[PDB]
UniProtKB/Swiss-Prot annotation:
Gene: CDK2
Active site (catalytic residues): D119
Result for mutant: Y15F: 2-fold increase in activity
Protein name: Cyclin-dependent kinase 2
Catalytic activity: L-seryl-[protein] + ATP = O-phospho-L-seryl-[protein] + ADP + H(+); L-threonyl-[protein] + ATP = O-phospho-L-threonyl-[protein] + ADP + H(+)
Phosphotyrosine PTM sites in chain numbering: Y15, Y19
UniProt effect for mutating P37L: In a glioblastoma multiforme sample; somatic mutation
Pfam name, any one: Pkinase
Any one of the GO CC terms: Y chromosome
The species this protein was found in: Homo sapiens (Human)
Modified residues (N-acetylmethionine): M1
PANTHER family: CELL DIVISION PROTEIN KINASE (PTHR24056), CYCLIN-DEPENDENT KINASE 2 (PTHR24056:SF521)
C-alpha cells in the first residue's frame, strides 16, 4: 500500500502475505494481508460484519491495482510461537482450557452464521496479553496438512462445520502433549497417520466412508490405539471431549456449541499468559 508503512513481514498464507504495518495518517498499527470474484468479495463482506471477541476484526478491504488488501486489527503473537516458547514447561492446563473454550466460542459464532474457517492451525490463532485468543486468516470457499479433517483428505466436495472441530481437536492435543498429533508430510501420510492412531475407518464407525471419492479398499487396516496413550497428561474429561472432536463421521463429531457444554469446562477460568514480545 501507499497509506501504509510496512514495519515487517510477519507471515504468509496460501493466497497472500501478511505484514505488520502502520497507518501513516492515523498511526494505528495493523496487520495487512496482501493478495495478488463476486463470490469472494461478498464472502469477504460477510466476514467484515462478523464481530466476536474471539474473531480477529477485519477493519478494511481495499481492492486496487491487481492487488487485494485486507486490513486486520493487530495481535502480538500467534499460538505456534507461544507453544514453542512454552515447550520446556508446557502451557498450564488452565490456560489450555481457556484457549480451547474461547476458540469454541468463536467457532460456535461463525458456524451459527454459516461461516467456516477451513484451515485452523496454530499459526492463525492469535493471542494478546489479556488472555484472549482469536481466530484469524479465514479460508475462503509448504502447506501444512497436520490439522486437515479426514473427510477433506478422502475427497469430500462439501465441507461442513465439522472440519473446524477436527482441526481444533488436533490443536488441543498439541497444546497438551507439546507434539503435533498427526504430523503428515503428504496427503496419504496424513491420512495414514490418522488411521494408525484412530483405526482405519469402516462402514460401522463411518457410514458411507467406503464410497468416498478417494477411499481405496486397499488402504491398510490398522486397529485403533488406546486413547490413553494419545494424550497421556490429559484427564478423562479432556480425553472424552477430544475423542468427540475427533470422531471420524462428520455427523457424529461434536459441535462447537455442544462442546462448550462439556464437563471439561466446568472449572474454566481466564488466566493471563506470560508473553515475551
Ligand atoms: C496470510 O495472512 C495471515 C496469516 C495469519 C494471521 C493473519 C492475521 O490476521 C494477523 S497476524 C498478526 N500478528 C502477529 C502474528 C504472528 C506473530 S509471531 N509469529 O508470534 O511473532 C506476531 C504478530 N495479527 C493479525 N491480525 C494473516
Amino acid at each position: 500500500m501507499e497509506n501504509f508503512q510496512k514495519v515487517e513481514k510477519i507471515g504468509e498464507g496460501t493466497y497472500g502475505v501478511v505484514y505488520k504495518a502502520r497507518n501513516k495518517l492515523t498511526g494505528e498499527v495493523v496487520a495487512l494481508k496482501k493478495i495478488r470474484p463476486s463470490t469472494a468479495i461478498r464472502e469477504i463482506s460477510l466476514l467484515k460484519e462478523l464481530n466476536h471477541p474471539n474473531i480477529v476484526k477485519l477493519l478494511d478491504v481495499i481492492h486496487t491495482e491487481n492487488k487485494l488488501y485486507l486490513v486486520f486489527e493487530f495481535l502480538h503473537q500467534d499460538l505456534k510461537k507461544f507453544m514453542d516458547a512454552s515447550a520446556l514447561t508446557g502451557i498450564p492446563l488452565p490456560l489450555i482450557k481457556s484457549y480451547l473454550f474461547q476458540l469454541l466460542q468463536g467457532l460456535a459464532f461463525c458456524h451459527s452464521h454459516r461461516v467456516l474457517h477451513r484451515d485452523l492451525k496454530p499459526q492463525n490463532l492469535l493471542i494478546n496479553t489479556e488472555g484472549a485468543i482469536k481466530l484469524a486468516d479465514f479460508g475462503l470457499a509448504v502447506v501444512t496438512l497436520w490439522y486437515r479433517a479426514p473427510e477433506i483428505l478422502l475427497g469430500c466436495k462439501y465441507y461442513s462445520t465439522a472440519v473446524d472441530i477436527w482441526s481444533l481437536g488436533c490443536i488441543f492435543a498439541e497444546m497438551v502433549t507439546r507434539r503435533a498429533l498427526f504430523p503428515g508430510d503428504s496427503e496419504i501420510d496424513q491420512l495414514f497417520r490418522i488411521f494408525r492412531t484412530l483405526g482405519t475407518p469402516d462402514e460401522v464407525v463411518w457410514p458411507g466412508v467406503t464410497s468416498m471419492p478417494d477411499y481405496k479398499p486397499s488402504f491398510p487396516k490398522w486397529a485403533r490405539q488406546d486413547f490413553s496413550k494419545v494424550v497421556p497428561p490429559l484427564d478423562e474429561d479432556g480425553r472424552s471431549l477430544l475423542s468427540q472432536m475427533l470422531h471420524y463421521d462428520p455427523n457424529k463429531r461434536i459441535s462447537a456449541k455442544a462442546a462448550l457444554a462439556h464437563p471439561f469446562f466446568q472449572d474454566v477460568t481466564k488466566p493471563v499468559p506470560h508473553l515475551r514480545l
